[PDB]
């Protein structure tokens, strides 16, 4: 789904205000109040991280505004979330400047913007339960497989392929960094992933020279960016949660309409148990994820710290404070 | 089994966030999100209850990390459990500070930390069905007697004796507070101990400077500490249960592998019956424990309150909610 000539040209003339050049470097930066700038913000981060000679200003602006277009008006898995995630990966890549190959940095920031392309606001579980055409196409990591698929289609549009100045092998390489990274955002896969990385980091056997070991780390970085609203400041964190549950509950409404009981997480009638559900989630998913990332990459510390601060706020909510 | 100097030297210089300080004092405090800070949480706890002048910093840090290194990689009875039991004691001691001697508070915090030392993840009943080495050596309270053997072995490790500077009277005295405390964590003994204290209280004959009554109160404090996952907020409690059964089921699987049927508690093909087992455990073991403890030590009331809360949560799980 292509962008207009008017859109990518409008993006070429954007310059970020100076009073946000500092803040964009903070892990806890909330893009919320700056909706008009989200695409320019991505260009900014892409230029800081990869430089202004990495992608042709024209081709890159096409890509971005097409990507924008191929995100839906779903309550959570929408354009805003793509740019929240891409950003976190920016902050992560910045604070680890000399560890990732040049091709990795390009691939990952792209992979992050594209990671939830054409999301319908329905879990993988849902699409398989009700024999959705997408579940027919891809049996496992259903939405994720589709997101990679969507990405490759946007690059194959006219003047959109931003990887034009690379060999066939370097282009083969990057479309695999992007593949693995998006497939990593399937949270079901995360659990296994983080478990092996734990084992490895302990026994001292974590080899960054190893390729399959690198994939696993990018894998956890992907999850870590995916969940990053658990690492914003409390009023930002509160608001994204409402977006998360609006989407969940909408899926459960669709399930009910068919005379089928959704799990309690997708039922509006159980609104009161959100604080507990969050605490449960922080404790079972978020903390481990960020605890391990901080181990592997010390500079990511502010992520865990912010997660711990949000954890306590939910605790306070549960306790009536 | 000794530890390495890398670990203990690090512990020495650790300092604790100002926000946690206010919250470690709470009964509901969950230590889960802070795995790195656990060894230093104990240090803080000792210093606040016993004084910064009470132990020589270096000998303590050595003790703690070697205790840590002697806890196994088992699902429940592991390092995290030790530090939680110890934190529950802390909060009980702090709320009843003058009722106990400095020697009792020293020993009880340390006895809580070392109480499951070297747990393999097999119950007393297993070892004594399957004639284990340890069961021929210790025939009653089998594992607990081993956990005390372990504590002393860590005190007898060179450079680890934190009680070196007590008088000779006090030294054999503190090791007896510790011996009794660990032994009392054998749940088999608890029901008798509980029934007795419950009797003495009702007929106004409970007397704190009667040493045998005193030892009985201490033992019950130990059980109340040992079970404290049931006093945490629901999602904390729920997550721990998983770890418990994850360990019970690993033991049933061993009996099955050997060809003998485990009790329903240790059989995973009977998960269905978990909420009803938790129901009865709360009604038969847990409530009675915190009920009687609150009668003897009224400032422990928040423990009964939280436990009743989770009893209500388990009653709701049964009822299909
Ligand atoms: C009632 C209400 C919520 C829950 C419940 C269970 N689990 C969760 C977590 C929801 C969730 C999922 N994914 C997230 C990603 C990023 C940030 C927050 C998230 N919260 N919520 C269960 C019953
Ligand atoms: C099937 C499943 C479980 C049970 C069953 C019986 N009794 C229990 C309680 C297990 C237990 C033991 N120790 C605990 C300590 C702290 C918190 C919870 C605990 N639960 N569970 C019986 C049949
Ligand atoms: Mg996704
Ligand atoms: Mg034990
Ligand atoms: Zn996402
Ligand atoms: Zn224990």
PDB file of N, CA and C in Angstrom, chain A residues 49 102 124 183 185 239 315:
ATOM      1  N   UNK A  49      21.771   7.414  14.053  1.00  0.00           N
ATOM      2  CA  UNK A  49      22.284   6.075  14.271  1.00  0.00           C
ATOM      3  C   UNK A  49      23.073   5.559  13.074  1.00  0.00           C
ATOM      4  N   UNK A 102      27.142  -2.542  11.182  1.00  0.00           N
ATOM      5  CA  UNK A 102      26.424  -1.460  10.495  1.00  0.00           C
ATOM      6  C   UNK A 102      25.097  -1.918   9.921  1.00  0.00           C
ATOM      7  N   UNK A 124      -2.711 -14.110  17.933  1.00  0.00           N
ATOM      8  CA  UNK A 124      -2.420 -15.273  17.089  1.00  0.00           C
ATOM      9  C   UNK A 124      -3.361 -16.405  17.379  1.00  0.00           C
ATOM     10  N   UNK A 183      10.024 -12.061  13.873  1.00  0.00           N
ATOM     11  CA  UNK A 183       9.559 -13.359  14.345  1.00  0.00           C
ATOM     12  C   UNK A 183       9.809 -13.463  15.861  1.00  0.00           C
ATOM     13  N   UNK A 185       9.290 -11.062  17.936  1.00  0.00           N
ATOM     14  CA  UNK A 185       8.275 -10.307  18.686  1.00  0.00           C
ATOM     15  C   UNK A 185       7.055 -11.142  19.087  1.00  0.00           C
ATOM     16  N   UNK A 239      -1.603   5.228  30.724  1.00  0.00           N
ATOM     17  CA  UNK A 239      -2.399   5.482  29.504  1.00  0.00           C
ATOM     18  C   UNK A 239      -2.263   4.424  28.404  1.00  0.00           C
ATOM     19  N   UNK A 315       1.313  -2.156  42.363  1.00  0.00           N
ATOM     20  CA  UNK A 315       1.268  -2.566  43.770  1.00  0.00           C
ATOM     21  C   UNK A 315       0.476  -1.555  44.620  1.00  0.00           C
TER      22      UNK A 315
END
